[PDB]
Symmetry: C2
Amino acid sequence: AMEKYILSIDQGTTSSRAILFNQKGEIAGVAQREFKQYFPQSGWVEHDANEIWTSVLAVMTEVINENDVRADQIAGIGITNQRETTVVWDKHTGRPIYHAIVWQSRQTQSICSELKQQGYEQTFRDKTGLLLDPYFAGTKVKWILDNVEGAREKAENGDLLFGTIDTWLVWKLSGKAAHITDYSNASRTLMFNIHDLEWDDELLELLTVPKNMLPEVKASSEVYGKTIDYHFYGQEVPIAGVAGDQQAALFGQACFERGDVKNTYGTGGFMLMNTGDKAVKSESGLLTTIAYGIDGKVNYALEGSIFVSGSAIQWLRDGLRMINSAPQSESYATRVDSTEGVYVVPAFVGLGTPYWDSEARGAIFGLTRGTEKEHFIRATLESLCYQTRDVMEAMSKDSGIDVQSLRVDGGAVKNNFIMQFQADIVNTSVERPEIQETTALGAAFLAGLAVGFWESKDDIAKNWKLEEKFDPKMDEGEREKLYRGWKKAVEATQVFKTE
Amino acid sequence: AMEKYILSIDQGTTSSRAILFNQKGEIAGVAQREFKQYFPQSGWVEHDANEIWTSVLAVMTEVINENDVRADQIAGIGITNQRETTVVWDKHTGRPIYHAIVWQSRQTQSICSELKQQGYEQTFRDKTGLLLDPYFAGTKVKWILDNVEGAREKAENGDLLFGTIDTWLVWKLSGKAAHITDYSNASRTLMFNIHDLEWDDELLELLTVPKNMLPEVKASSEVYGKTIDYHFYGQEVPIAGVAGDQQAALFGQACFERGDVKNTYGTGGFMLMNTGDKAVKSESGLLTTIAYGIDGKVNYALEGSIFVSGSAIQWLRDGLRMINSAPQSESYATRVDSTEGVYVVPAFVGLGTPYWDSEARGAIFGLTRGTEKEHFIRATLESLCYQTRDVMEAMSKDSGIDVQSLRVDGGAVKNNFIMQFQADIVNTSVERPEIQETTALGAAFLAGLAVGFWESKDDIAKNWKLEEKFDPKMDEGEREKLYRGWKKAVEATQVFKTE
Ligand code: NA
Ligand code: NA
Ligand code: NA
Ligand code: NA
């Protein structure tokens, strides 16, 4: 028809989403499909990359069939994704050789430990902006090659390809035409040198990964290829935007300049501040990473990473079966006026910023006989806010900027209790936008800019609108007592080590 | 209708029960009524002594009325009770001047802290067999006298009486005719010297308790007085048995000789070993206490005290609202094969034997995204077994004897999962009797003995019947791994302390 749209695919940790955006920046359709989470041992997290692929096909098809947009009205596709999660597959069959190892997974701990013991952690820090934690892709690749029968040989024979999720989806979607990643996704692999913007041969040799398995690193806004016709209703549509999910949210929050910051509350909680054209080092447990590559420039970021944020609330539903839906948690949490000393430390897959303790597991403290369901749920919800304060403190310290207002996005932001508690505990305003799908919006703009659907990234800034600003309303004394109890809870959590 | 019965009152922490026994030792009727638990602040636990008194009247009435046994068929009454719990009342009005302060309550912490600071713990220990923990009566009397307005003045004037629950009930029931306690209950007050067998002047001065408030200390099997007619359907029935509930259970398990031991799983968990006619000092966190006074002799015991045992299960029911009843916990716990590294340390009111840490609160460890309701419940159930093991390691050290089989009673013993896991985690057989209401039976015998209903306590031994012997079937490697994580769980629990 006459109107054209951009299709954005957000392949998350627990679900895949496809959202259509019109010229005005409005959402013209959304579809979401969950896929299985595998936890074969304590702290491991795996996905079936085949199911992830079918979930992406499922949401593309749903969003095109069920709104008023046909495949021929799609001007371009942007792809964004859960970062670090690693897929290794056979290039001829297109079949993965093992589950995708998820970013959260701690299964590559023995590998990180060995590399740390051999004295290489500083080299990885200096070259990648990360550290030797199980979070990153490199060790997941090594794990697959070392532990899966036949993997090593196939790797040696040139039969295998590596990819983060963006890479996997583009290869499948393009009919094997394009094996690529962008700078933001590559920066999370532990194999890409963020300073010289090239795969690093030393790091690859330390990780025992053959260079023949790697995609070509590209900018985040560029026509990488097109959909193979049979995966897009007979049409060949430009695949033109790719960035890691948290970086996409950064771009979708118009945080384009040095000091601009946002926090995303998803499965995990990720605060990123754009540091412009220079990489900034951190002494307080932040990652130095790449924001995006566009217009021939590369922006870097400082990141605070929290492994379990919104997924703490989901655990209350799926795990303990205490609530029917995440939004229902607010009613329980607000039915009491305090947690009465209870803390929940949801270190289900260890602790990220600033602790970086991959052996810690989840714990709960301050329980008494009068602790009710309301208190427990309330404490679970406040853990999203306490973890964010930990990150903010590290971020304000290392950035040298005092954050006077945080833009936020992700599912948990709809929860007024959590947003207000957040503002209170950090004594900083929290701003929730009208369109909270910033990850999708960012990827849509990367693609749309590449195909000339939009002319300027500033449209994002212009279109952004404040839905609600939460202002701190809690005395310094209460705030400081509450936070001291949180830090004590984390301290106690770190003592529980059995492994 | 000719035949006579003994009525046994068990005034527990969460309910009062009245059980009728015939000459054959058979249960001829049971009535139970719950009363309100008050948790006004975290760690505090209070009861309304007026509601305890009406709950007792209620179960006496229900059990006779509903089993067609006439009041004039009761040959005697035995009273047993939650120990330490403290009532202070006006002798003219019979009205308590405050709630009863429960054994569990931590509200007397500061009072214990001051006496410890002043250097007085080892005097309390040497005289009473106890320690300066909020568990015991003495500091509860002081708290009431210091914090209830006008109370100090009324005490000084002779208007007030003190009683543990036994004393309160006997006073009310006899229409103010008898203000007494037995040696077992008195031994738990922090005011009674267990070696000299008398109220201790030094200890009263330190606690600031006037001696005029104290009842007379008697044997556990003696006619103390009779029911006042209007509280017992026009009859004046001998009140002839009084012992602390755990001591009554010891007696009811036929544990009459040196080395005989039982564990009772109730609100709390209590292991007592009879030590014959001599008091044994503990070096490993056991209390030295009085078992009972009968036939002109006084038996002593060693005790391991766990504050939260079966009440952890009740917490799943009324606190987190995860189960409909304690028995339903079994099906969830056995639906999985292990807790997968989850531990539940139910220190809601601190830790008793052997840690004696009154500031510790409840905690949970080892949580992952895959921890489900079933895991959480199972770990909660195992906590009863781990705490018992802690007490058994202590008990074995400060006695010579290593348990060969443990006689058990209380509400949780009906749960086969728990008894089997208990036997497995300690590598010792557990024997569950056919009649599990040993506390009630013990109190019935103390009464019946005193009125000639039974001529010998040997009948308890002869009537006891094994219902099921649980035999350990767990690999030693597994047992040691499991118990090591429990100990680490407790270590981490002890780190969480707030200001
Ligand atoms: Na997700
Ligand atoms: Na359910
Ligand atoms: Na109990
Ligand atoms: Na007899």
